[PDB]
Structure formats: C-alpha cells, structure tokens
Design a protein around this ligand. Sequence first.
Ligand code: CL
Ligand code: CL
Ligand code: CL
Ligand code: CL
Ligand code: CL
Ligand code: FE
Ligand code: NA
Ligand code: NA
Length: 174
Amino acid sequence: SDLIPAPPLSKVPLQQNFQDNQFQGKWYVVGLAGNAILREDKDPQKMYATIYELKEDKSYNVTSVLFRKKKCDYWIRTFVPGSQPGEFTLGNIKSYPGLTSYLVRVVSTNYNQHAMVFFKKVSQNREYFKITLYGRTKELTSELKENFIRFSKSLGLPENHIVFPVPIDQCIDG
Ligand SMILES: [Cl-]
Ligand SMILES: [Cl-]
Ligand SMILES: [Cl-]
Ligand SMILES: [Cl-]
Ligand SMILES: [Cl-]
Ligand SMILES: [Fe+3]
Ligand code: NA
Ligand code: NA
C-alpha cells in the first residue's frame, strides 16, 4: 500500500559496452534491495540462483531456482533486448496477470565475478523496483557489498530494505 517511489532512470547507470554473450550462465543472488524487499530475522531469506541463456534471437531465457518447502522451485521468464545494450523488457507480458510494465537494466558487471541489475515493474498499478547483487560465487567481498549498499541507498532505500541472502547448497549447486 505504501511504497518508496521508483527512482528516475537518470539515477540508474547502464553498463557500457554490454557483452550479452559474457553475461550468460549461473549467477547467485548475494544481495537484494527494493521497495518491496523487507529484512526479516524470524526467517532470513535463503540464497537463490538465476541462469541467463542467450537464444538465437539474442533474447535471454532467464531461469531461476530457489529452495522452498524442501523442494526446488523453478520459474522462467524472457528478457527481450530493449533500447540499448544491457537493457531489457519482459517478453509475453500478457501472460502475467496485473503486469503492465517490466524493465531490466544491467548497472555494472565484470562478467566473471560480480554484477548489479536494476529491475522496475508496474503490477496492479503499483510501481516496484529492486536491485540484485549478482555473484559468480556465493560469497563476495566487503567492498562489493558496500558498493551495493551505497547504490541502493542512492535510489532511496533504507538499510532494512537491503538484504543479503544466506548461502545454501540445495538447488543452486546444479
Ligand atoms: Cl512485488
Ligand atoms: Cl534474479
Ligand atoms: Cl512464477
Ligand atoms: Cl509480476
Ligand atoms: Cl573489479
Ligand atoms: Fe520478478
Ligand atoms: Na523515465
Ligand atoms: Na520456506
């Protein structure tokens, strides 16, 4: 009902010279921040993974897996290339009830260790945004994590809207 407003796109940098082929493969979600992301010490969020695969038409098949209720839950989406390289929109938006808008922007990455990706969506007329700290391994440095916190706070998010999922072995080691 009450949400921190989505930042203007001007405050969200784009990764220059984005190599879509180098971004393919498994990323661990080492950090999560957003207006719908709430820290919870009763049941801390478990780490999940996201796999990016380039298709023939240069769009990503994006498969994520998380460990929930003793089972691995998979969910798939298609990122269609947007206006500029490193920016995407959701394919087949009509298949998602309530969804009128969905934008993805890769803020930064070195392709072999870390990445930061900005997501923006409008669902049920409510505007959500999040930033994911991607890791090639399950652990990242304190320097990279503090940079993620800095960037998240620059978009208007407080600390309790920034979480670092706990590493697990189930589902995400495949
Ligand atoms: Cl949401
Ligand atoms: Cl993700
Ligand atoms: Cl789903
Ligand atoms: Cl949705
Ligand atoms: Cl670096
Ligand atoms: Fe989503
Ligand atoms: Na805009
Ligand atoms: Na659970």
